[PDB]
Amino acid sequence: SQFLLTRLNDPKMSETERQSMESERADRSLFVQELLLSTLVRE
Amino acid sequence: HSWFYFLSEYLMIQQTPFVRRQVRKLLLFICGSKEKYRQLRDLHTLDSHVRGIKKLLEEQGIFLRASVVTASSGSALQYDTLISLMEHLKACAEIAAQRTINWQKFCIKDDSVLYFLLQVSFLVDEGVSPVLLQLLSCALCGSKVLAALAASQEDQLCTALVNQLNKFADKETLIQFLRCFLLESNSSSVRWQAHCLTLHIYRNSSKSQQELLLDLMWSIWPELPAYG
Questions:
Q1: Would you call A4 an interface residue with chain B, using a CB distance cutoff of 8 Å?
Q2: CB B119 within 8 A of CB B136
Q3: Residue B1 DSSP label
């Protein structure tokens, strides 16, 4: 614990921040699904 | 006050247990209260111990002329000399561990103490290093920070002591202290203690002092490969 630099990681997020992250993740998942489906279309 | 000095000297002088008890009771009654009596007794004891340490060091040819401790002989001290130094050193260490506030007050009164101790440590042997480091950390890092690492007015005293040390110290002295105690220190406990002391000093340091310290550290950084 003597290493002071070890405690560098200090991340935090608001509840609104968590909700926004969830919405962005949902949008990203939808875009990924659409892209993957496009990869399997009929030529 | 002269009576107080004589009573402190008598307390230091060997006497009967009843005589010592009577002298302690008289000093406590005369000198206001237990707090003031203990402070005065500790001040006298620390002054005597420091005077003896300085006398011994001068006897070994190490003389601090005005602020620079110079010695002509390159050889180290004898084992008996080291034991004698460590005696008063441990006494003062116990005293400071008792009441770091009193130790800080004594240091404030005797501004020639801290820099002299640091200079002496740079020339002292490896064994004495832990005690000197503990004393310096107690003085500067303070009792609260030291206790926390073990897991207001004192803060002001620490800040003033840091200012005094900055005033007394020189750049080359700081460089040598950092090099010896942080890169040359074979012991890991010594390394951790040095890290704690340096962090405390930087915390209470001035802005321009902090800039100078960072410059010195980044300068030393080029030679890091040798220290392993």
A1: yes
A2: no
A3: -
Taking contacts as CB-CB distances below 8 angstroms, the residues of chain B near A2 are 192, 195
Buried b / exposed e across B69-101, counting CB within 10 Å, b at 16+? beeeeeeebeeeebebbbebbebbbebbeebbe
| B177 closest CA partner among B222, B121, B226, B139 | B121
Q: Give this entry's resolution in angstroms.
A: 3.4
How far apart are the C-alpha atoms of A10 and A7, rounded to whole Å? Answer: 7
Distance between CA atoms of residues B118 and B107, nearest Å? 13
Method: cryo-EM
Tokens read off for A35: 């892209």
Cα–Cα distance measured from residue B201 to residue B164, given in angstroms and rounded to the nearest whole number: 12
> DSSP labels for B83-130?
HHHHHHHHHHHHHHHH-HHHHHHHHHH-THHHHHHHHHHHHS-TTTHH
| Chains A–B, number of C-beta pairs less than 8 Å apart | 4
Q: What is the per-residue DSSP string for B151-168?
A: --HHHHHHHHHHHHHHHH
